């Protein structure tokens, strides 16, 4: 019932960059940088506070795969996640912004 | 030889928020938010690209401890790290910015 959950469940399309049994990455429809990707856990979790360390290890691994696929790994990129509406979170599913440019 | 490495060693003082065997947190001397903390690995690592997943699991755990000590865990916060000079990294030691709303 939420925009990223809809993507996970395949209700709405996206520009998929990379996908894993536990994670999914895709382009942001309103880019804030030359390359702007989003990395999300397929599991239903709302923000960074609700991710286990074990899973963030696997996400870190997945993040390296994304930035390397995008070819910005060595050029340089920003890693960002907003925890809660007061820190600017708009969609309530854990997601990391990857920007480079 | 570098400003955060000096803090780790402990050549220059800081406003230590929390510390443990592998990580250290402290306030940023030029805040960009009401609460602005930095989380750094004591191990000599330059940026996010050079952290192992295993260690980022333990850092995630450590990050939860700092935001809860700062009392912004539930109010809301931003998590940011810059990878490389081209993404705005100024100090060349892996660090996560924790900003508050
Ligand atoms: N249908 C969608 N597909 C891809 N990205 C989206 C969609 N709807 C919103 N977004 C992005 O998700 C982000 C929401 O902001 P935030 O919650 O602060 O990370 C924004 O950067 C939006 O551009």
* Domains of chain B, earliest start first: 1-101 (3.30.428.10)
**Residue A47 near ligand 1, beta carbon < 6 Å:** no
**Residue A91 near ligand 1, beta carbon < 6 Å:** yes
Closest ligand 1 atom, residue A92 Cα: 17
Judge contact between B95 and B81, C-beta under 8 A.
yes
Resolution (A): 3.0
Whole-number Cα distances in Å, B21 to A6, A28, A63, B9, B18: 41, 38, 26, 13, 11
What tokens does A50 get? Answer: 């609700």
Instruction: Please give the backbone phi and psi of residue A35, each rounded to the nearest 5 degrees, phi first.
Output: -115, 125
Closest ligand 1 atom, residue A80 Cα: 19
- Closest listed residue to residue A26, CA positions, set A35, A34, B101: A35
- Alpha-carbon gap: A101 to the closest alpha carbon of chain B (Å): 7
Q: Which helix (H) or strand (E) holds A79?
A: strand A77-83
- Closest listed residue to residue A37, CA positions, set A83, A81, A88: A81
CB contact under 8 A, B49 and A58: no
Task: Enter the DSSP assignment of B8.
Answer: H
């Amino acid at each position: 019932m939420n925009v990223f959950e809809k993507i996970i469940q395949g209700e709405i399309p996206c520009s998929k960059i990379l996908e894993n049994e536990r994670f999914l990455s895709f382009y942001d429809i309103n880019p804030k940088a030359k390359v702007h990707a989003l990395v999300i856990p397929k599991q239903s979790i709302q923000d960074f506070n609700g991710i286990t360390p074990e899973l963030m290890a696997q996400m870190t691994s997945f993040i390296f795969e994304v930035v390397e696929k995008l070819g910005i790994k060595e050029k340089g990129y920003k890693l960002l996640t907003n925890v809660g509406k007061n820190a600017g979170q708009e969609v309530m599913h854990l997601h990391f912004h990857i920007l480079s440019g």
